[PDB]
Amino acid sequence: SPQPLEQIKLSESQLSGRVGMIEMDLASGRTLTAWRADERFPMMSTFKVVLCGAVLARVDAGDEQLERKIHYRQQDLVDYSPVSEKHLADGMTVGELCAAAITMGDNSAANLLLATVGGPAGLTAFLRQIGDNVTRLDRWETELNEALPGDARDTTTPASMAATLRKLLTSQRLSARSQRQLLQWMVDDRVAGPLIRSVLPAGWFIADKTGAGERGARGIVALLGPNNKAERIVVIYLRDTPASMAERNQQIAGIGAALIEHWQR
Numbered sequence: 001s002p003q004p005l006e007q008i009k010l011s012e013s014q015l016s017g018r019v020g021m022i023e024m025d026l027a028s029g030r031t032l033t034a035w036r037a038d039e040r041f042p043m044m045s046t047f048k049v050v051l052c053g054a055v056l057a058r059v060d061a062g063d064e065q066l067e068r069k070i071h072y073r074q075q076d077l078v079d080y081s082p083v084s085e086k087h088l089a090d091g092m093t094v095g096e097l098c099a100a101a102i103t104m105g106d107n108s109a110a111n112l113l114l115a116t117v118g119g120p121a122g123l124t125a126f127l128r129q130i131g132d133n134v135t136r137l138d139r140w141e142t143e144l145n146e147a148l149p150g151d152a153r154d155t156t157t158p159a160s161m162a163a164t165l166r167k168l169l170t171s172q173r174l175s176a177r178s179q180r181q182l183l184q185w186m187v188d189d190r191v192a193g194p195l196i197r198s199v200l201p202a203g204w205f206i207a208d209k210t211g212a213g214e215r216g217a218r219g220i221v222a223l224l225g226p227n228n229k230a231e232r233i234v235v236i237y238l239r240d241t242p243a244s245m246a247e248r249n250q251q252i253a254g255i256g257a258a259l260i261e262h263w264q265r
Ligand SMILES: OC[C@H]1O[C@H](O[C@H]2[C@H](O)[C@@H](O)[C@H](OCCCCCCC3CCCCC3)O[C@@H]2CO)[C@H](O)[C@@H](O)[C@@H]1O
Pocket: 001, 196, 199, 200, 201, 220, 222, 223, 224, 234, 235, 236, 252, 253, 254, 255, 256, 257, 258, 260, 261
């Protein structure tokens, strides 16, 4: 594999789309690689990690409990609800909803949680409170990943998303238990985690949340590193490419391969 930046460029050439990428030390925030890092990209399902950061902040403040059971109706369900559709009779706890949203990609679970934090506007306000002045959520599942060209709704930048994830996971804005919980949800991803592990060399840590959208939109927010340590935050977004899902996945994996082969920078 070529160098990370060289691979990123090749991916844009091959996909005819824009790639946005940040690689950042988790402990310190040292930026190692930045490409279109201040450009906007649709967050897609990656917003679910920030959503559950807001939930945990409410738990820390005593305004929420992960134990609290929410009962909902079939009319509340949106497209793709593999866990929430199973609990119309008995409900789900707030913590179960975060687990379902982040680890199983459950969309109704995300919407239920979004309501508890005051909707897209409430989540955006939370982002402003932690000093993210760029990321914005405007819509609910499933409209939020429409990825219209030039539409600023439901977008982040690689730099903003990396910084925000670092804040939630490490900055002590969340309690120790809450930081640990958010991390464990990412470790437990079942949508892409097991697949990614299957292709990572021995010794590489992965935790992640992935997303997909229209017009080629695809993305991942990840913790990655050798010696089984979450050494770096890696955020990669793609937009405005007509390529197959397989090829978009392969190109992102190829950027990962370049990072792995050329880690010591
Ligand atoms: O010399 C470094 C390594 O080179 C290869 O490893 C390959 C591996 O066989 C391949 O499957 C992977 O694909 C990349 C898979 C990435 C999966 C997604 C990555 C995520 C992670 C965080 C955000 C970016 C995307 O690349 C590495 C590096 O070439 C060798 O197989 C391995 O023995 C060796 O230790």
